[PDB]
Design brief:
globular, about 210 residues, binds zinc ion
Length: about 210
């Protein structure tokens, strides 16, 4: 149900905001984990609603959350670049919707782009060398190209989602975040993505398919 699914997604957003607020005793990496989990949820909710004023408000909320976290963790010098990336992502999501890209493709693209931003911020915060950062950026650019060429159905999207989550979990662990903490947040991303993937079996063309 579109309304039940929405209610669950705003519940997940509220819970993520509550955890992000409990930031005093969190490390910068844990804060970055909370923030990109929230922004992933916000962008998944915007994809689900497909509504102009919702796009505007959730983009505002994502930009606000990113700026607040960057200030807290002493990465204020990144604010403009990060805001640009977030805006670029939201613009691209809207573009792929307007051009008729499959919802599977849009959801995988969104998850991949949020992770790319997340891992970049985590590596910058940990002081990784520019060559290692580039290594990870290029490997995931290649992976994105393949995944978007590969994902044609909901089953394929669910399998690719699992693969993505497994590998990024390994990378977040290597950066020093508690494996179990990573798992809690990546599980929340998986559940939201499955919820949005659920809608579209019931959008108007999907209904025409089922009912003929
Ligand atoms: Zn949390
Ligand atoms: Zn649609
Ligand atoms: Zn509206
Ligand atoms: Zn405003
Ligand atoms: Zn960019
Ligand atoms: Zn066009
Ligand atoms: Zn390992």
């Amino acid at each position: 149900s579109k309304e039940e699914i929405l209610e669950q997604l705003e519940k997940m957003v509220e819970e993520a905001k509550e955890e992000l607020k409990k930031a005093k005793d969190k490390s910068p990496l844990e804060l970055i984990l909370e923030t990109l989990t929230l922004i992933t949820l916000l962008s998944l909710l915007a994809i689900a609603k497909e509504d102009e004023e919702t796009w505007k408000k959730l983009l505002e909320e994502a930009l606000e959350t990113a700026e607040e976290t960057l200030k807290l963790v002493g990465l204020e010098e990144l604010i403009e670049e990060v805001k640009k990336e977030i805006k670029e992502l939201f613009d691209e999501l809207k573009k792929m919707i307007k051009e008729g890209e499959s919802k599977e493709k849009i959801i995988i693209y969104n998850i991949l782009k949020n992770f790319e931003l997340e891992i970049l911020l985590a590596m910058i915060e940990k002081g990784e060398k520019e060559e290692e950062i580039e290594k990870y950026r290029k490997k995931w650019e290649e992976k994105l190209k393949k995944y978007l060429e590969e994902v044609k159905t909901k089953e394929e999207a669910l399998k690719i989602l699992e693969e993505i989550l497994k590998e990024r979990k390994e990378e977040l662990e290597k950066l020093g975040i508690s494996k179990e903490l990573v798992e809690k947040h990546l599980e929340r991303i998986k559940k939201a993505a499955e919820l949005v993937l659920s809608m579209g079996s019931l959008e108007s063309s999907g209904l025409e398919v089922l009912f003929q």
